[PDB]
Amino acid sequence: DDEEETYRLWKIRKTIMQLCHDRGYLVTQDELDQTLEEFKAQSGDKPSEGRPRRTDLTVLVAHNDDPTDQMFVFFPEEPKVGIKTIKVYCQRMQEENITRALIVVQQGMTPSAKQSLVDMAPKYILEQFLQQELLINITEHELVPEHVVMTKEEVTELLARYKLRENQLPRIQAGDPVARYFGIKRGQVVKIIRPSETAGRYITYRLVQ
Amino acid sequence: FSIGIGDVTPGQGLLKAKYELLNAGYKKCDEYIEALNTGKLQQQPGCTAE
Amino acid sequence: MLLFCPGCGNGLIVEEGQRCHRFSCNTCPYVHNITRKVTNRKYPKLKEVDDVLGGAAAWENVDSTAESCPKCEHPRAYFMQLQTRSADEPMTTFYKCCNAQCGHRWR
């Protein structure tokens, strides 16, 4: 004990950071290849480490298009997150003056906060991931073909090519694990590059509903 | 072209081989059942003795 | 194991209402105080402890000696054993091997 939990912490940090990079926010390469021993060097052993704070991260910004757009990552400690804790998180958020933030739950989170997690504000939205899921980054799994998001012009050209109306494309569910990974909203489009049985590749497009 | 019982009658050496083989199998069959019922049989590491 | 009243042949329960616990009947005033101890239970029931230490669990159960395969003998399948059902029930030993693209696991 105190070694498996630290391994979990390092792994979840690695995967979440990979997701931040993939979404295109600011990130430093030297931290991408951070080792577990490096994590021990930069953070003490489990008994000496405080879960609700130690891992909190907000360095990532949307430097891809706007370095001024900061983003916040939180890691509660209680097995089920409570209303008061998210109220503290939301007041801290308002103090920081940001739009969105990510939350990592250990085991669950209370039903009243389940309901609140859809209607905090039109201008603010929150995204919750399970520790269990984050332990592995699905993007690397063998059975998940590469997904890519594209700009509105690309979809314009595509729909012009086949002479289609947007609502004719194949669908992809919003709650899909990959859709959650990419944090994409309804009405976007996704390209897929299925690895053929041979060197070839097949391209197909799916819409998020 | 024809088929007749001359074409499905066993030959000489077949009798002898069949006799010897059938003997062999039965002795081995006896040996295994004796090893089991005495408990000396070595359980195969994928199933029970039976 | 069950207890029954000599006076009425019915099952006995255990209760305390004085300095010492007793077996007593709920039909007749027969009572038998228990001044000493007895050593047989009802064999209670709780389910299978499977993944309490799943995955790469604590490292305190390392051991020195291990067996080997008859085919390839690559370096990674150190021993484990386990149990079947219950206190008076037997134990079973298996041997399982997992590199990739196969299904091997011996008994």
Ligand SMILES: [Zn+2]
């Ligand atoms: Zn009675």
